[PDB]
RNA sequence: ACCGG
RNA sequence: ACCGG
């Protein structure tokens, strides 16, 4: 049937001029040595990406799918959504959202500028007065930083981004924002992925695994899910939206949005040249995250019925999806999964790499991470979220005139605070750096570093400062990643940590806390870490 | 550099 | 800002 994209062969130009690395990376050259391996995706690689994503979809649904879709609409019916006032939309625009082509930007929008509030009214009236004309959109290359994997063919090409003018973006919010806060939580419940902090993701996955007599789990990746979404799936999404309590104005607009934007349209580069036409998901629109989730759920669940997966419990983080079922024997389990894949493939949701059944929770990668285990302070098992540290380390090492990685360190320190690689490698490096800049209290991305222990206690719990026997997978993987990037091995980081710890303590004050809590693992004679007063405040 | 979290 | 698309 339909082709995901068409191409005029125009260049996909970049926004922020791509910047050359420099001969000295002063913040990270003590973190790791192999900067040659750390690269960022250029837009000249945008061509390469388009080939990977341009291709024919053909879709064949069935009794199974139809039954799920019927059930899901019935859940949609229990929802009541309201329009957002044009103003309310504007206040939800992010601070530096790319300015509109009609001479105004996010400051104006958020402050209800007249030029702004006028054009948007016009944009909206046109949505109600016109549901066929395709809305033009812009296509850009997202630049992300990775580490060269030769195993999987040198360097990734840049991801493609497609979005409409800021005027239109606000209207989408007017029409849909309320649905986006109500619908998913209501068609998918426990299985909606974004509602969970890593702590609770783990807690769910455990509860799911616990409650099967003889569990079996697998994860289904679709690394081009956006390309494989069909015009019909999109309209089916509308159909799901319309199944709720909605005012007639909302309904007309949603429809008009679906036909004019969400289903497809032309794309233009920053230079303005017609770049191509699209017939799949746009990354930049409001519904994407919600759409993919719901669609993936309908399909996935159809597939389980088609394949005969028993007692399936699901988790959907957009494209990435985990299922935990009752094993029907490894013999059947391998059959049923192949089925699942054929089902999904008919549903126009193929995979990258086929799934495999697994019977150990440590081996189920998804939401780009996995569950693993170490021992807490009293010997009890502590289950926690982790991932391969390669990219985190690569990015930890990205420095240019217009970019600092310190935020990325703080990022992963928070998110992955209880992992051995954060605790031993990124923390030791972070404080080591900030101490020497004597910049230990400057607010990085709106967080004070001296608040870390308090934050970590709130988000991860006291055992995040005290875990101790890390699993073979993790130990192996981390060793390997550091070796792979020219980082010192774990044992060196221990030394470094002790010295870093000695300082933080002698500094007294909040710094002292950081020393005693964050690096308690570093010392021979451990310290009884009682809970933190400041902790209940966050 | 758009969307989500 | 970070992380995911």
Cα–Cα dist A179/A91, whole Å: 17
Cα–Cα dist A123/A128, whole Å: 9
Q: Are A140 and A125 in contact (CB under 8 A)?
A: no
A293 Ramachandran zone, left/alpha/beta (phi>0; psi -120 to 50) = alpha
Q: Are A169 and A163 in contact (CB under 8 A)?
A: yes
Structure-determination approach: X-ray
Q: How far is CA A483 from CA A31, A151, A328, A409, in A?
A: 12, 16, 41, 19
Give the SS3 label for residue A378: coil
The total of other beta-carbon atoms located within 10 Å of residue A536's CB is 10
Give the SS3 label for residue A220: strand
Residues 256-275 of A with CB under 7 A from strand C: none
H or E element at residue A86: helix A86-91
The total of other beta-carbon atoms located within 10 Å of residue A445's CB is 10
Q: Are A256 and A131 in contact (CB under 8 A)?
A: yes
Cα–Cα dist A264/A135, whole Å: 8
Cα–Cα dist A98/A18, whole Å: 18
| Residue lying closest to nucleotide B3, CA to C1' | A284
Distance A37 CA to B4 C1' (A): 30
Give the SS3 label for residue A163: strand
Tokens 């699209």 label which residue?
A: A278
Question: % helix / strand / coil in chain A, to the nearest 5?
Answer: 50, 15, 40
Distance A497 CA to C5 C1' (A): 36
- Domains of chain A, by residue range, sit at 1-368, 369-538
**Was A226 annotated as part of a binding site?**
no
Q: Which two tokens stand for residue A427?
A: 């923390």
Cα–Cα dist A184/A199, whole Å: 21
Cα–Cα dist A318/A466, whole Å: 33
Q: Are A393 and A34 in contact (CB under 8 A)?
A: no
Distance A436 CA to B4 C1' (A): 37
Q: How far is CA A260 from CA A136, A164, A165, A278, A417, in A?
A: 9, 11, 13, 11, 44
Q: Which two tokens stand for residue A245?
A: 């309590």
Nearest nucleotide to A411 (CA to C1') is C2
Please state at what angle helix A427-436 crosses helix A509-518, rounded to 10 degrees.
160
Beta strand pairing call for A38-40 and A145-147? antiparallel
H or E element at residue A282: none
Distance A475 CA to C1 C1' (A): 30
**Was A320 annotated as part of a binding site?**
yes
Which positions of chain B lie under 7 Å from any protein Cβ? 1-5
Residues in chain A: 538
Nearest nucleotide to A106 (CA to C1') is B2
Distance A261 CA to C5 C1' (A): 18
Nearest nucleotide to A416 (CA to C1') is C3
The backbone torsions φ and ψ at residue A312, rounded to the nearest 5 degrees and listed phi first, read -75, 135
Question: ∠A83-A85-A90 over CA atoms, to 5°?
Answer: 120
Please state at what angle helix A490-506 crosses helix A427-436, rounded to 10 degrees.
40
């Amino acid at each position: 049937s339909s082709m995901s994209y068409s191409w005029t062969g125009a260049l996909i130009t970049p926004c922020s001029p791509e910047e050359e690395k420099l001969p000295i990376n002063p913040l990270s050259n003590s973190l790791l040595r192999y900067h040659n391996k750390v690269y960022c995706t250029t837009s000249k690689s945008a061509s390469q990406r388009a080939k990977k994503v341009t291709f024919d979809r053909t879709q064949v649904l069935d009794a199974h799918y139809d039954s799920v879709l019927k059930d899901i609409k019935l859940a949609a019916s229990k929802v009541s959504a309201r329009l957002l006032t044009l103003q309310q939309a504007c206040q939800l625009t992010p601070p530096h959202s790319a300015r509109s082509k009609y001479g105004f930007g996010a400051k104006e929008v958020r402050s209800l500028s007249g030029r702004a509030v006028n054009h948007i009214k016009s944009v909206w009236k046109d949505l109600l007065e016109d549901p066929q004309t395709p809305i033009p959109t812009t296509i850009m290359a997202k630049n992300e930083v990775f580490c060269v994997d030769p195993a999987k063919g040198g360097k990734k090409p840049a991801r493609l981004i497609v979005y409409p003018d800021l005027g239109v973006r606000v209207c989408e919010k007017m029409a849909l924002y309320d649905i986006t806060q109500k619908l998913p939580q209501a068609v998918m419940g426990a299985s909606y992925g974004f509602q969970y902090s890593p702590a609770q993701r783990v807690e769910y996955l455990l509860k799911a695994w616990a409650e099967k007599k003889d569990p079996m789990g697998f994860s289904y990746d679709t690394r081009c899910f956006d390309s494989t979404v069909t015009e019909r799936d999109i309209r089916t999404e509308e159909s799901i939206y319309q199944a709720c309590s909605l005012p007639e104005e909302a309904r007309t607009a949603i429809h008009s949005l679906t036909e004019r934007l969400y289903v497809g349209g032309p794309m233009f580069n920053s230079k303005g040249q017609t770049c191509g036409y699209r017939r799949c998901r746009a990354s930049g629109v409001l519904t994407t995250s919600m759409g993919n989730t719901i669609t993936c759920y309908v399909k996935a669940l159809a597939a389980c019925k088609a394949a005969g997966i028993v007692a399936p419990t699901m988790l959907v983080c957009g494209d990435d999806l985990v299922v935990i079922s009752e094993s029907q024997g490894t013999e059947e389990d391998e059959r049923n999964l192949r089925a699942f894949t054929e089902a999904m493939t008919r549903y126009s949701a193929p995979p990258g790499d086929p799934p495999r059944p697994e019977y150990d929770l440590e081996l189920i990668t998804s939401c780009s991470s996995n569950v693993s285990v170490a021992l807490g302070p009293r010997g009890r098992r502590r289950y926690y979220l982790t991932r391969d540290p390669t990219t985190p380390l690569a990015r930890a090492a990205w420095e240019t005139v217009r970019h600092s990685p310190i935020n990325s360190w703080l990022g992963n320190i928070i998110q992955y605070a209880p992992t051995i690689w954060v605790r031993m490698v990124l923390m030791t490096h972070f404080f080591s750096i900030l101490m020497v800049q004597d910049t230990l209290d400057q607010n990085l991305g709106g967080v004070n570093p001296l608040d870390l222990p308090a934050i970590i206690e709130r988000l991860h719990g006291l055992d995040a400062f005290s875990m101790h026997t890390y699993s073979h997978h993790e130990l192996t993987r981390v060793a390997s990643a550091l070796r792979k990037l020219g980082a010192p091995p774990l044992r060196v980081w221990k030394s470094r940590a002790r010295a870093v710890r000695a300082s933080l303590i002698s500094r007294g004050g909040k710094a002292a806390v950081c020393g005693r809590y964050l690096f308690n693992w570093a010392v021979k004679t451990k310290l009884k870490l009682t809970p933190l007063p400041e902790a209940r405040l966050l």
